[PDB]
Design a binder for these strands. Structure first.
Ligand SMILES: NC[C@H](Oc1noc2ccc(-c3ccccc3Cl)cc12)c1ccccc1
Ligand SMILES: NC[C@H](Oc1noc2ccc(-c3ccccc3Cl)cc12)c1ccccc1
Lengths: 188, 482, 479, 185
DNA sequence: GAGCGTACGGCCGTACGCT
DNA sequence: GAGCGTACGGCCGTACGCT
């Protein structure tokens, strides 16, 4: 499912994570295939905060991401074996985009924290009002979102590791009451 | 800096999702009982006048129209939501009239949307009645190229009637269906006594009434659910023990619990027998047919006590199932756990609003029309002068000014007279105009009486609910054993 | 009781005939299969025109499946997608927004994701569809009317081409250059007895959207003569310095899958079945265009490796011309000239019928205006007649009897508004009436003289050629 | 995907072959589940006249039909091990119905000829498709032994049958094309 | 437990003729 | 051959909370 770039120099390579083959195809047309790889996922990914480790390692989407990055996970994680120095989360401009974004960030923070620390995790910002990236044309998707000359990536910065541990456990954890409390407190 | 704090990103991203799933996906509005996708389907049926009198239209046509104009999401999400509204075993009062394979109780899905056709049910007209009389607020659709209704008039109490189940974020909803007759008697009781107790309401509303019928064990769960919005209700299959010949008996099941899969439930029983985990069952057949209705037969060994096997089946299979009541709906756009009385109060208040606004609108339109008829009367009564005035006028603008000046007419009345057709100068047409004008004056007076006295208006709500109860009310199906 | 032989023969014939006349073979007139025609007509009925904004594909497919095409959503959507691909259709008939696939054979995104409308040239396919130019027929359930054929104001069968697997037969017609085609039709329209050879001075050969090369005129000639011929297509490839060389491919043959073609080359190298290739990259980008690079070992001969690649991969492909289309509802193997003759005859019919229709409508309107003129000229009497009338029915009879009016004219006068009795309004009516009489006379000149029609057709074809004509892409190499 | 009947007496049992789960569900509701089984197929079935034997025996729809009948195929075919004495082909009243009918008949004639000889193969006659009908109406018109109108497939001339299957369903296109032109109306 | 019901998604067969 | 392009078809993943 990975459409890899020609360059084997990680320092100048970047991988784009997209919601499906819908966005996958539009992206593969738009991209600079010299330095820009594409891994299309298959919708909602496993919530690793709730799931047991057996299920996580057997998950096909989790496996493809580990293989693509080539860093391994947890203790065996090796930042120098990284195959891209920019992992770009490019989810649609909608609410289910925001959910797949929180689910991926939960995976990166629990299994590849040093990737976030190194500043290798970024968040693309497609212009709002198209349905998703499966609804954009490749010419326009390149110029706004993927072209290093005009694009606006957000670099994910981890400031407080204690506050981060509490936030992932509250939003993505199995305890419903803390999550519900957070929503009521922060509603509107 | 294009730089973004991971904590800020998580909190704002997750909140955007969570809030959206709560107020615009998974939870129904307390007023019309509808989630967005349901509302958009019924409104889409209405905008393409797919009414009960007109013939069934292809589902792919309906799903395409709804997805294009109102609901920017998957065709499967829309079609499956429409299918469920058409299943007489899912919806106590079906809102969609289906033609073709819309599934069975065995959990085989509906055929694909290419294969099926659909329209409104007669009762869905009551959900939409007066939607065009400024009774509910419209809002822009997702792309701003269309107007969609924020809520339906809902001239019957649909949230409780049909019920609702929905997994949101931080919360879910599970509301059982009810008997429409019992509900409307409940609302009438409440509309006469604002201070009515849950206990008194339950003399009208005995408990849930599932489309699949069956039995509810006791009033404890029902009471707790109507008191607090949360309660467990024990549902049970209607089963009897009967002689099958040769002195051997059998258990016959004719009604199963709500939302239980018949095919799956039989497989659990066959699996208990295969695995020798229940003793005495010699055969298991599904003799269900359109002629007989639901009929699951369990043959019992000659030695064996059939009543003991039935009690074991209840303990060990979905032949007895709990319905976990969790009455969460949107009230002023926010999720609230509501008791039976809050749900009925919010509904009655919605009806008072709809009928008041309808009356205000009917009065507006009637007055505008009465004003025009006053102009046409003057024009017909002095038609010879009107013609000369218009003939000596060079342009429409001059004729408008001359008519207004000469006959003391408004701009609206002068426009109406210039738009009048020659066929309106016949003898019968002058009488027809004065007939309409006299009826209009009585109607305007009737409408003003309603807006003047809230008790008159509330009685109109009571009377229209009673008409719906008499046309669509039906017998209880689920027996509540005390 | 049913004989197995009788059941087979009647059952299979029902299927076979249905696949031939109503699925897989295009009509010779508009070049369209049923599914294509129903999509373009569906776009037109919901006024999804180039000027208006893109509508969701799921909305379009639903409407088409509901009203005209009682078959799978996938069959409809994929047929619409292809019409929108600039690498499939030489003159795209659908304007797509979103992922409508690539040359690598990645599919279009699902119909929930994409939006679509007409292309400016699809207006020419539909022009005058509402002027009784083509026969309508009942749809599958009899609740709707659909067009049997489109006006097709440009020759779409040859322009865009057509491939279709039927039963007992298939079709394979290559796309053509529109400019060359229309020059061909003009030549034919001046000389009914024209030779295929003379037509080929206008129509050099196929013109694929993907460009590339055709080897020789032998295959092309045989195909245009007889309706059957093999045409050898070849990638545009050069050898260039990289002191080592490389083969660069910038254009591939028509309907060849880029991703698959590269995999065949990699597979020949993996399986040591071709000698001398040291690397294989696809440097294609939307900015650079198509660019497949094949690195050659130092002091390996690159020309020999290129000739081997042609023999052993789709880098060279044959296009098997099999020009079968529906003529008077029956499949016929047709030569280039039959295809152009049937098209020109369709145009003569469409323009004649349009003119007959315009005349009909103008005369009906002139008749109404004659009634309004009489009514305005004796308005005082007309009013009294209507006023003394008790019902509309009595007024109609009295007006007809008293003023020698038709039922249509009396209806028009009863429907006339009072604002039409002002001074400027009488002049406005006589202005419209006089212009109408000139128009009726212009239309009758066209119906009277078949040659006057032809001269008009020339000018409207020339306008289309000037707006839509474009350069050849596929080079045809002699020898 | 087989919904079998309760009775294990083949002489009074019948199996209905339908185009998909569309018709499958409508049929399963309509049927007398005591004596009427249903095998919903998955669209166009393999043309066994064109296909190689390896592919035929590996085909999942061909396998399900062999398993359902329990007779086996070719030489090992045993008419007495038949689990139904009525195999009913119930395809839609359209052109793609007629094709799936010719494809099934080709399978039965080449691999289970004695089933046709024994008069066990029938053709239902639904009154656009039956995937679009309700179960109540599908029973009364097509499946109810009291009012239904089955056609029993009778094999008269085995030589003429062999030529007809080879011409319509065989790999030789020219004989098929000739037949269509000759019989076109 | 597992599956309820709106949401984000994906993957496989078959016929037909021609080269 | 193996794949072109309309047709007949089908089957699986994920979130979310509560019983
Ligand atoms: N009343 C307690 C609680 O309310 C909420 N839970 O989550 C929420 C998220 C958002 C809002 C909201 C508040 C203000 C404005 C707009 C909005 Cl959208 C309210 C709640 C509850 C939940 C479930 C059941 C019973 C009670
Ligand atoms: N016209 C030459 C000849 O015709 C046919 N071949 O197969 C056919 C099948 C059906 C019909 C037909 C006849 C009457 C009405 C409707 C129809 Cl569809 C005609 C032909 C031909 C042979 C070979 C190739 C191309 C064309």
């Amino acid at each position: 499912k990975l459409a890899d770039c020609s360059s084997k120099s990680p320092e100048e390579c970047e991988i784009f994570l997209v919601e499906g083959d819908s966005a996958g195809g539009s992206t593969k047309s738009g991209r600079d295939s010299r330095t820009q790889a594409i891994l299309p996922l298959r919708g909602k990914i496993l919530n690793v905060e709730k799931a047991r480790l057996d299920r996580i390692l057997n998950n096909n989407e989790i496996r493809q991401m580990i293989t693509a990055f080539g860093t391994g996970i947890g203790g065996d994680f090796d930042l120098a074996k990284a195959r891209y120095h920019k992992i770009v989360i490019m989810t649609d401009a909608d609410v289910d985009g925001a959910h797949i974004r929180t689910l991926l960030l939960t995976f990166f923070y629990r299994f590849m924290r040093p990737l976030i620390e190194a500043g290798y995790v970024y968040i693309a910002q497609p212009p709002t009002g198209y349905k998703g990236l499966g609804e954009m044309n490749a010419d326009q998707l390149w110029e706004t979102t993927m072209n290093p000359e005009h694009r606006a990536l957000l670099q994910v910065k981890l400031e407080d590791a204690i506050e981060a541990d509490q936030t992932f456990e509250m939003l993505m954890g199995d305890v419903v009451e803390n999550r519900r409390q957070f929503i009521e407190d922060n509603a509107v | 800096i294009n730089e973004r704090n991971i904590t800020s990103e998580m909190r704002e991203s997750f909140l955007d999702y969570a809030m959206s799933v709560i107020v615009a996906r998974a939870l129904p509005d307390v007023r019309d009982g509808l989630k967005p996708v349901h509302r958009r389907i019924l409104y889409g049926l209405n905008e393409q006048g797919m009414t009960p009198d007109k013939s069934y239209k292809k589902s792919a046509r309906i799903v395409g129209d709804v997805m294009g104009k109102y609901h920017p999401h998957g065709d499967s999400s829309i079609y499956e939501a429409m299918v469920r509204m058409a299943q007489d075993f899912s919806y106590r009062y079906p809102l969609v009239d289906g033609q073709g394979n819309f599934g069975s109780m065995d959990g085989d899905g509906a055929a694909a949307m290419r294969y099926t056709e659909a329209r409104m049910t007669k009762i869905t007209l009551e959900l939409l009645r007066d939607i065009n009389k400024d009774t509910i607020d419209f809002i822009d659709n997702y792309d701003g190229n269309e107007r969609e209704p924020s809520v339906l008039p809902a001239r019957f109490p649909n949230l409780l009637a049909n019920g609702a189940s929905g997994i949101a974020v931080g919360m879910a909803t599970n509301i059982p269906p009810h008997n429409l007759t019992e509900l409307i008697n409940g609302v009438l009781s409440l509309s006469k006594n604002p201070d009515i107790s849950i206990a008194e309401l339950m003399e009208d509303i005995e408990g849930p009434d599932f489309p699949t019928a069956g039995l509810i064990l006791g009033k404890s769960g029902i009471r707790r659910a109507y008191e607090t919005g949360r309660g467990s209700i024990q549902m049970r299959s209607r089963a009897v023990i009967e002689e099958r010949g040769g002195g051997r008996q059998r258990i016959v099941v004719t009604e199963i619990p709500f939302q239980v899969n018949k095919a799956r439930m039989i497989e659990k029983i066959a699996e208990l027998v295969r695995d020798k985990k229940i003793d005495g069952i010699t055969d298991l057949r599904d003799e269900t047919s359109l002629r007989t209705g639901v009929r699951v037969v369990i043959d019992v060994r000659k030695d064996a006590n059939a009543s003991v096997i039935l009690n074991n089946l209840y303990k060990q299979t979905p032949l007895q199932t709990s319905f976990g009541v969790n009455m969460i709906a949107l009230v002023n756009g926010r999720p609230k756990l509501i008791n039976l009385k809050e749900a009925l109060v919010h509904y009655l208040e919605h009806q008072k609003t709809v009928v008041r606004r309808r009356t205000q609108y009917n009065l507006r339109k009637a007055k505008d029309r009465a004003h025009i008829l006053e102009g046409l009367r003057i024009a017909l009564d002095h038609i010879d002068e009107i013609i000369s005035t218009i003939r000596e006028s060079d342009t429409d603008k001059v004729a408008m000014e001359s008519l207004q000046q000469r006959f003391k007419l408004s701009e609206k009345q002068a426009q109406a007279i210039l738009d009048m057709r020659l066929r309106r100068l016949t003898g019968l047409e002058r009488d027809k105009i004065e007939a309409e004008y006299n009826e209009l004056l009585n109607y305007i007076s009737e409408l003003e009486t309603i807006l003047a006295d809230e008790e008159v208006l509330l009685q109109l709500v009571r009377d229209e609910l009673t008409e719906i109860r008499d046309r669509f009310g039906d017998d209880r199906r689920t027996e509540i054993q005390l």
